[PDB]
Design a protein around this motif. Sequence first.
Motif, short mmCIF file in Angstrom:
data_model
loop_
_atom_site.label_atom_id
_atom_site.label_comp_id
_atom_site.label_asym_id
_atom_site.label_seq_id
_atom_site.Cartn_x
_atom_site.Cartn_y
_atom_site.Cartn_z
N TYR A 31 0.84 -1.16 0.00
CA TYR A 31 0.00 0.00 0.00
C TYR A 31 0.87 1.21 0.00
N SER A 34 2.28 2.00 -3.28
CA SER A 34 1.32 2.60 -4.16
C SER A 34 0.13 3.04 -3.38
N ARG A 35 0.12 4.31 -2.93
CA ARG A 35 -1.06 4.78 -2.26
C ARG A 35 -1.74 5.78 -3.14
N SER A 36 -2.90 5.39 -3.71
CA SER A 36 -3.64 6.28 -4.55
C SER A 36 -5.06 5.82 -4.53
N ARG A 37 -5.98 6.68 -5.03
CA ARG A 37 -7.36 6.32 -5.06
C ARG A 37 -7.97 7.00 -6.24
N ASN A 38 -9.27 6.75 -6.48
CA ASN A 38 -9.98 7.43 -7.53
C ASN A 38 -11.44 7.25 -7.32
N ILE A 39 -12.25 7.99 -8.09
CA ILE A 39 -13.67 7.86 -7.99
C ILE A 39 -14.22 7.79 -9.38
N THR A 40 -15.24 6.94 -9.59
CA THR A 40 -15.77 6.79 -10.92
C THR A 40 -16.34 8.10 -11.36
N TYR A 41 -17.10 8.76 -10.47
CA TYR A 41 -17.71 10.02 -10.76
C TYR A 41 -18.76 9.87 -11.82
#
Lengths: 54, 50
Positions: A31, A34-41
Amino acid sequence: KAAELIANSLATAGDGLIELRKLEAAEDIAYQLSRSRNITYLPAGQSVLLQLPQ
Amino acid sequence: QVAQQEAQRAQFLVEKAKQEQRQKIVQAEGEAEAAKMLGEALSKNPGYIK
C-alpha cells in the motif's frame, strides 16, 4: 522490544503466525509503495429553462 | 544611505554564514553522540538492535 514481543508471540503462535504477519506487513508495504485512489464520478447535469408554450 | 544599507547587509550575510557553520558542526557532533549512545543502548541484547 516490539521485535522481542512479536517474536515471542510468533514463537508461541507457531510458524503460521509469522507467515501471515508477513503477509499483512507486505500488505502495508504494498500500500505504501502505491497509495492512490480514484472515484468513478458521474457528472451532474446542468440546467436551463425554456418557456413552454400555452 | 545606500552604503549603510549595503554594509549592514554584508555583515548580516557573514554572520549568518558563521551561524550556519556552527549549526552544521553541532548537528554532526550530535549525530555522532547519538550513534555512540544508540550503540551503547544496544546493550539490551541483540533483539534490541534487530
